[PDB]
Design an enzyme around this catalytic site. Structure first.
Site: not given
Ligand code: ZNV
Length: 162
Positions: A11, A20, A32, A104, A117, A132
């Protein structure tokens, strides 16, 4: 390395209101202020956040305090979210930093939508998760930052930040 150092790299630090990558008024270490096009609206949010009349400018101490609050809010949003918490709890410490980084940047609701994912990450299918994760507006719009975060999920190391 830790989540604070990681996000400080991603950042930067600016003490005056800036925009941003999406064009939204921001300050400090990626705080933000508003999605409104009104600079006055942004300045009002800033004064409320800091507790004084800032004129769009803060100190380094204030930027770092806002940053601590923002990191904590990301963690709290993960821990309160029924989709994110089980995945977060399954990860090692370095990969948890990558998860906080995404929340974040995009917020808990946005990250909670990364359903496939998240499943791959919980299953520890790191290479497939990395592929992915890159199939996203996130990766296409901020590819260097997304690549660092994805490499962190893929390897469980800080290699992308060293
Ligand atoms: C989708 C990818 C972000 O991965 C996470 C985000 C928040 C909490 C757990 C995670 F694995």
């Amino acid at each position: 390395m830790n989540i604070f150092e990681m996000l400080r790299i991603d950042e930067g630090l600016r003490l005056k209101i800036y925009k941003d990558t999406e064009g939204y008024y921001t300050i400090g270490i990626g705080h933000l202020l508003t999605k409104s096009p009104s600079l006055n609206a942004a300045k009002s949010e800033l004064d409320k956040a800091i507790g004084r009349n800032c004129n769009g400018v803060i100190t380094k101490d204030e930027a770092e305090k806002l940053f601590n609050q923002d990191v904590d809010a990301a963690v709290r949003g993960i821990l309160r979210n029924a989709k994110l918490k089980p995945v977060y709890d399954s990860l090692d410490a370095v990969r948890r930093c990558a998860a906080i980084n995404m929340v974040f940047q995009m917020g808990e609701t946005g990250v909670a939508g990364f359903t496939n994912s998240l499943r791959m990450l919980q299953q520890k299918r790191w290479d497939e998760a990395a592929v992915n994760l890159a199939k996203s507006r996130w990766y296409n719009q901020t590819p260097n930052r997304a690549k660092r975060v994805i490499t962190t999920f893929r390897t469980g190391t800080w290699d992308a930040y060293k």
